[PDB]
Design a protein around this ligand. Structure first.
Ligand SMILES: [Ca+2]
Length: 223
Protein backbone atom coordinates (compact mmCIF):
# COMPACT_ATOMS: atom_id res chain seq x y z
CA UNK A 1 0.00 0.00 0.00
CA UNK A 2 1.48 3.33 -1.10
CA UNK A 3 0.34 6.50 0.61
CA UNK A 4 -1.74 4.75 3.26
CA UNK A 5 -1.58 4.42 7.01
CA UNK A 6 -0.85 1.80 9.65
CA UNK A 7 -4.17 0.05 10.18
CA UNK A 8 -3.59 -0.92 13.81
CA UNK A 9 -3.17 -4.49 14.98
CA UNK A 10 -6.13 -6.78 14.20
CA UNK A 11 -8.36 -3.85 13.10
CA UNK A 12 -8.96 -5.61 9.75
CA UNK A 13 -9.92 -9.03 11.11
CA UNK A 14 -10.80 -10.62 7.76
CA UNK A 15 -7.34 -9.84 6.27
CA UNK A 16 -5.21 -12.91 5.73
CA UNK A 17 -1.61 -13.39 4.69
CA UNK A 18 -0.87 -16.26 2.32
CA UNK A 19 2.51 -17.77 3.24
CA UNK A 20 4.72 -20.23 1.33
CA UNK A 21 7.79 -19.68 3.46
CA UNK A 22 7.18 -15.93 3.27
CA UNK A 23 4.19 -13.63 2.75
CA UNK A 24 3.32 -13.59 -0.94
CA UNK A 25 -0.32 -12.42 -1.22
CA UNK A 26 -3.27 -11.23 0.77
CA UNK A 27 -6.73 -12.72 1.00
CA UNK A 28 -10.05 -12.31 2.78
CA UNK A 29 -11.71 -14.71 5.23
CA UNK A 30 -15.32 -15.26 4.14
CA UNK A 31 -16.30 -18.05 6.62
CA UNK A 32 -14.49 -20.30 9.08
CA UNK A 33 -13.11 -22.57 6.33
CA UNK A 34 -12.70 -20.40 3.19
CA UNK A 35 -10.56 -17.54 1.91
CA UNK A 36 -11.04 -15.52 -1.26
CA UNK A 37 -7.92 -14.26 -3.05
CA UNK A 38 -6.72 -13.52 -6.59
CA UNK A 39 -6.16 -16.29 -9.11
CA UNK A 40 -2.80 -14.78 -9.92
CA UNK A 41 -1.84 -15.72 -6.33
CA UNK A 42 -2.27 -19.41 -7.07
CA UNK A 43 0.54 -21.73 -5.98
CA UNK A 44 0.80 -25.03 -4.17
CA UNK A 45 1.90 -25.24 -0.55
CA UNK A 46 -0.12 -22.37 0.89
CA UNK A 47 -0.36 -21.75 4.62
CA UNK A 48 -3.10 -19.26 5.54
CA UNK A 49 -2.10 -16.87 8.33
CA UNK A 50 -5.02 -15.30 10.17
CA UNK A 51 -4.87 -12.80 13.01
CA UNK A 52 -1.71 -11.20 11.72
CA UNK A 53 -0.35 -7.70 12.27
CA UNK A 54 3.46 -7.89 12.16
CA UNK A 55 4.06 -10.79 9.73
CA UNK A 56 7.62 -11.25 11.06
CA UNK A 57 6.79 -11.48 14.79
CA UNK A 58 4.52 -13.86 16.67
CA UNK A 59 2.36 -11.40 18.62
CA UNK A 60 -0.30 -13.67 20.08
CA UNK A 61 -3.42 -13.62 17.93
CA UNK A 62 -2.29 -15.63 14.94
CA UNK A 63 -3.85 -18.80 13.55
CA UNK A 64 -1.74 -20.64 10.97
CA UNK A 65 -3.75 -23.18 8.97
CA UNK A 66 -2.63 -25.00 5.85
CA UNK A 67 -4.79 -24.99 2.74
CA UNK A 68 -6.42 -28.24 1.79
CA UNK A 69 -7.62 -27.16 -1.68
CA UNK A 70 -7.40 -24.16 -3.97
CA UNK A 71 -9.94 -23.46 -6.74
CA UNK A 72 -8.98 -20.97 -9.42
CA UNK A 73 -12.00 -19.51 -11.23
CA UNK A 74 -12.95 -21.74 -14.18
CA UNK A 75 -12.55 -18.86 -16.63
CA UNK A 76 -9.41 -17.17 -15.23
CA UNK A 77 -7.19 -15.84 -18.03
CA UNK A 78 -3.67 -15.11 -16.78
CA UNK A 79 -2.82 -12.95 -19.78
CA UNK A 80 -5.68 -10.49 -19.37
CA UNK A 81 -6.37 -11.15 -15.66
CA UNK A 82 -10.05 -11.51 -16.46
CA UNK A 83 -11.80 -13.47 -13.66
CA UNK A 84 -8.90 -12.93 -11.25
CA UNK A 85 -10.40 -14.81 -8.30
CA UNK A 86 -9.59 -17.98 -6.37
CA UNK A 87 -11.01 -19.79 -3.36
CA UNK A 88 -8.86 -21.50 -0.75
CA UNK A 89 -10.25 -24.02 1.74
CA UNK A 90 -8.53 -24.46 5.12
CA UNK A 91 -7.59 -27.90 6.46
CA UNK A 92 -9.35 -27.09 9.70
CA UNK A 93 -11.87 -24.40 10.65
CA UNK A 94 -10.52 -21.14 12.03
CA UNK A 95 -11.65 -20.13 15.49
CA UNK A 96 -13.56 -16.94 14.89
CA UNK A 97 -13.25 -14.13 17.36
CA UNK A 98 -13.04 -10.31 17.40
CA UNK A 99 -9.59 -10.38 15.77
CA UNK A 100 -10.21 -13.23 13.31
CA UNK A 101 -13.55 -12.69 11.56
CA UNK A 102 -15.19 -13.23 8.22
CA UNK A 103 -16.22 -10.41 5.88
CA UNK A 104 -19.64 -10.43 4.24
CA UNK A 105 -20.10 -10.95 0.49
CA UNK A 106 -21.99 -8.27 -1.43
CA UNK A 107 -25.64 -8.50 -2.23
CA UNK A 108 -25.34 -6.00 -5.08
CA UNK A 109 -22.48 -4.33 -6.84
CA UNK A 110 -20.99 -1.10 -5.52
CA UNK A 111 -21.13 2.22 -7.36
CA UNK A 112 -18.52 4.69 -8.40
CA UNK A 113 -17.81 7.12 -5.55
CA UNK A 114 -18.29 4.51 -2.83
CA UNK A 115 -15.56 4.71 -0.18
CA UNK A 116 -13.69 1.54 0.51
CA UNK A 117 -10.84 0.20 2.64
CA UNK A 118 -7.92 -1.48 0.87
CA UNK A 119 -5.29 -3.26 2.96
CA UNK A 120 -2.16 -5.35 2.76
CA UNK A 121 1.53 -5.97 3.38
CA UNK A 122 2.65 -4.89 -0.09
CA UNK A 123 5.29 -2.38 -1.12
CA UNK A 124 4.84 1.12 0.36
CA UNK A 125 6.90 2.99 -2.27
CA UNK A 126 5.84 4.21 -5.73
CA UNK A 127 9.47 4.32 -6.94
CA UNK A 128 11.67 1.81 -5.28
CA UNK A 129 10.88 -0.74 -2.64
CA UNK A 130 10.07 -1.04 1.04
CA UNK A 131 8.02 -3.82 2.54
CA UNK A 132 6.25 -3.24 5.82
CA UNK A 133 5.94 -5.68 8.60
CA UNK A 134 2.62 -4.39 9.93
CA UNK A 135 -0.64 -4.17 8.01
CA UNK A 136 -1.22 -1.02 5.96
CA UNK A 137 -4.55 0.55 5.01
CA UNK A 138 -5.86 2.97 2.41
CA UNK A 139 -9.27 4.60 2.14
CA UNK A 140 -10.10 5.04 -1.55
CA UNK A 141 -13.15 5.55 -3.74
CA UNK A 142 -14.37 3.40 -6.56
CA UNK A 143 -13.83 5.20 -9.88
CA UNK A 144 -16.33 5.33 -12.74
CA UNK A 145 -16.06 2.56 -15.32
CA UNK A 146 -15.59 5.20 -18.02
CA UNK A 147 -12.58 6.76 -16.20
CA UNK A 148 -11.21 3.22 -15.57
CA UNK A 149 -11.51 2.30 -19.25
CA UNK A 150 -9.94 5.58 -20.28
CA UNK A 151 -7.02 4.96 -17.94
CA UNK A 152 -6.39 1.46 -19.37
CA UNK A 153 -7.64 1.36 -22.98
CA UNK A 154 -8.61 -2.07 -24.15
CA UNK A 155 -7.95 -3.76 -20.81
CA UNK A 156 -10.88 -3.28 -18.42
CA UNK A 157 -13.52 -6.01 -18.54
CA UNK A 158 -16.92 -6.14 -16.91
CA UNK A 159 -15.20 -8.19 -14.15
CA UNK A 160 -12.88 -5.33 -13.13
CA UNK A 161 -13.18 -1.92 -11.50
CA UNK A 162 -10.75 0.84 -10.69
CA UNK A 163 -10.35 2.42 -7.28
CA UNK A 164 -8.01 5.08 -5.99
CA UNK A 165 -6.84 8.49 -7.14
CA UNK A 166 -6.07 9.61 -10.63
CA UNK A 167 -3.61 12.15 -9.30
CA UNK A 168 -1.53 9.20 -8.07
CA UNK A 169 0.25 8.96 -4.68
CA UNK A 170 -2.18 6.49 -3.07
CA UNK A 171 -2.63 2.91 -4.32
CA UNK A 172 -2.17 -0.79 -3.74
CA UNK A 173 1.14 -2.31 -4.85
CA UNK A 174 3.15 -5.54 -5.21
CA UNK A 175 2.39 -7.92 -2.35
CA UNK A 176 -1.09 -6.51 -1.77
CA UNK A 177 -2.30 -8.90 -4.52
CA UNK A 178 -5.31 -10.96 -3.51
CA UNK A 179 -6.28 -8.77 -0.60
CA UNK A 180 -9.52 -7.00 0.20
CA UNK A 181 -11.39 -3.96 -0.99
CA UNK A 182 -14.20 -3.56 1.57
CA UNK A 183 -16.96 -1.03 1.17
CA UNK A 184 -19.71 -0.55 3.84
CA UNK A 185 -18.88 -3.94 5.39
CA UNK A 186 -18.93 -5.89 2.08
CA UNK A 187 -16.07 -7.44 0.13
CA UNK A 188 -16.45 -5.69 -3.23
CA UNK A 189 -12.93 -6.07 -4.67
CA UNK A 190 -9.77 -8.11 -4.75
CA UNK A 191 -6.38 -6.50 -5.39
CA UNK A 192 -5.66 -7.55 -8.99
CA UNK A 193 -3.36 -5.41 -11.15
CA UNK A 194 -2.22 -1.97 -12.30
CA UNK A 195 0.62 -0.18 -14.11
CA UNK A 196 3.22 0.28 -11.43
CA UNK A 197 1.81 1.75 -8.21
CA UNK A 198 0.46 5.16 -7.32
CA UNK A 199 1.23 6.53 -10.79
CA UNK A 200 -0.78 9.44 -12.23
CA UNK A 201 -3.67 8.26 -14.36
CA UNK A 202 -3.00 4.59 -13.42
CA UNK A 203 -5.28 3.65 -10.53
CA UNK A 204 -5.41 0.16 -9.16
CA UNK A 205 -7.59 -2.41 -10.86
CA UNK A 206 -9.66 -4.82 -8.76
CA UNK A 207 -11.68 -7.96 -9.35
CA UNK A 208 -15.41 -7.17 -9.20
CA UNK A 209 -16.47 -9.58 -6.48
CA UNK A 210 -20.23 -9.00 -6.85
CA UNK A 211 -20.11 -10.85 -10.18
CA UNK A 212 -18.79 -13.97 -8.45
CA UNK A 213 -21.06 -14.37 -5.42
CA UNK A 214 -23.14 -17.15 -7.01
CA UNK A 215 -19.99 -19.07 -7.98
CA UNK A 216 -18.50 -18.58 -4.51
CA UNK A 217 -21.63 -19.79 -2.74
CA UNK A 218 -22.16 -22.82 -4.91
CA UNK A 219 -18.47 -23.76 -4.80
CA UNK A 220 -18.49 -23.61 -0.98
CA UNK A 221 -21.73 -25.61 -0.84
CA UNK A 222 -20.17 -28.55 -2.69
CA UNK A 223 -16.57 -28.48 -1.46
CA1 LIG B 1 2.60 -12.04 13.53
Amino acid sequence: IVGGYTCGANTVPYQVSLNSGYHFCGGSLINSQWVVSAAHCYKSGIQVRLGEDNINVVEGNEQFISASKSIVHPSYNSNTLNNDIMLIKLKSAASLNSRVASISLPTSCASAGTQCLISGWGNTKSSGTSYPDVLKCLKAPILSDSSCKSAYPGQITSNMFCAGYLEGGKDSCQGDSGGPVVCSGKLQGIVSWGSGCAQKNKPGVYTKVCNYVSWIKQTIASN
